[PDB]
């Protein structure tokens, strides 16, 4: 249950952490601010992304990713592969040769921001797009609305 798991000290760049501990600043009271910004078209910043204790360079609220462009929607199908979930967005293509439709899909991998507790199998997830994060990962998780739950035995 620790944050320093990598071999280098993972830290937000902008907040300045080494500031003037003298005997006026007593060591029985320890606190730091946690950097977060707000993007733009009306999304909340969820609770555990502000007072949370994690760290990321690629979370859209507390990393250097400035997310802009399209906003798309999907269904979670595969939640392996650390900090990265695979969502299978699924559409209905139209062919005018038969005047009838055709089921098609191509799944897509998005960056799981670590401020979320339950992101399970089969969840409707809204997702915006940003700069390229990896070779497959471009997009980014914003907000999980309820699915596969609200009541689990």
């Amino acid at each position: 249950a620790d944050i320093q798991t990598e071999r280098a000290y993972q830290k937000q760049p902008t907040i300045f952490q080494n500031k003037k501990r003298v005997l006026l600043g007593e060591t029985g009271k320890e606190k730091l601010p946690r950097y977060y910004k707000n993007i733009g078209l009306g999304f909340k910043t969820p609770k555990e992304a502000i007072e949370g204790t994690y760290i990321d360079k690629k979370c859209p609220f507390t990393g250097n990713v400035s997310i802009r462009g399209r906003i798309l929607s999907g269904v979670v199908t595969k939640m392996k592969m650390q900090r990265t979930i695979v969502i299978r967005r699924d559409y209905l293509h139209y062919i005018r040769k038969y005047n009838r439709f055709e089921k098609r899909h191509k799944n897509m991998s998005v960056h799981l921001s670590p401020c979320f507790r339950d992101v399970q199998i089969g969840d409707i997830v809204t997702v915006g797009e940003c700069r390229p994060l990896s070779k497959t990962v471009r997009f980014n998780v914003l907000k999980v609305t309820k699915a596969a739950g609200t009541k689990k035995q």
Partner: protein, 259 residues
């Protein structure tokens, strides 16, 4: 291929320049300038297809090398300079003073002006920014910049600057009920007041435009050019008056005027 282009084929040049299909294979290919290569109309075909003071391309050089062409008061000697929007030419040999604004049919209209209203231009602002050492700047619809501006001028205001001096002259803030001209798209060349600047977070803003004759059309915001408080233009105003006539509305005024 390995670098940028310096030719232009004929049919790639826009259809409102009205070039002959058979005179040759190439286009003007205007220079790099303040007005981009699709919107603008170069100085060359304006004299040899529009004004028809010339015959060839050689004729246009040997008036323009002798330094009597004054685009916006500045003596220009190249043949394919990009002229653009809110432009004033000045022959200053026998008093021409044209002004090139889009007509009611989507083309550049040869429009004469008195030599006293030919003393300025209007510039839609598109980016202001606080420059270094605590001063602000801006930039115009074309590639002009202005230091120390009047800070009521906010984004997509239209300012005025006067030639041969260069300072700010007039400003008019973007607001509803105020007259403008759309300078691009499917509705360019038709002129009307602004119902509202309807907004979009993220995406393009598209505004609702009401003319002087009750038509209600719309273009997106990056073509709106304000020249009017209430409804008064600060500029000379052509025939057509920024009102586009339908195919029945044209044919009765075209076949009652060749009588």
């Amino acid at each position: 291929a390995r670098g940028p282009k310096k030719h232009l084929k004929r049919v790639a040049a826009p259809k409102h320049w009205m070039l002959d299909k058979l005179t040759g294979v190439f286009a003007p290919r205007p220079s790099t300038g303040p007005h981009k290569l699709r919107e603008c109309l170069p100085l060359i075909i304006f004299l040899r297809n529009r004004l028809k003071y010339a015959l060839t391309g050689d004729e246009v050089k040997k008036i323009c090398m002798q330094r009597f062409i004054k685009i916006d008061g500045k003596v220009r000697t190249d043949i394919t300079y990009p002229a653009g929007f809110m432009d004033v030419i000045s022959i200053d040999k026998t008093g021409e003073n044209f002004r090139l604004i889009y007509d009611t049919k989507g083309r550049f209209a040869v429009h004469r002006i008195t030599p006293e209203e030919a003393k300025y231009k209007l510039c839609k602002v598109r980016k202001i920014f606080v420059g270094t050492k605590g001063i602000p700047h801006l930039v115009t619809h074309d590639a002009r910049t202005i230091r120390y501006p009047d800070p009521l001028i906010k984004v997509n205001d239209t300012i005025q600057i006067d030639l041969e001096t260069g300072k700010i002259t007039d400003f008019i803030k973007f607001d509803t009920g105020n007259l403008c001209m759309v300078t691009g798209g499917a509705n360019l060349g038709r002129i009307g007041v602004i119902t509202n600047r309807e907004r979009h977070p993220g995406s393009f803003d598209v505004v609702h435009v009401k003319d002087a004759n009750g038509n209600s059309f719309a273009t997106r915001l990056s073509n709106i050019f304000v020249i009017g408080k209430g409804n008064k233009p600060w500029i000379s105003l052509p025939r057509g008056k920024g009102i586009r006539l339908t195919i029945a509305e044209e044919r009765d005024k075209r076949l009652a005027a060749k009588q």
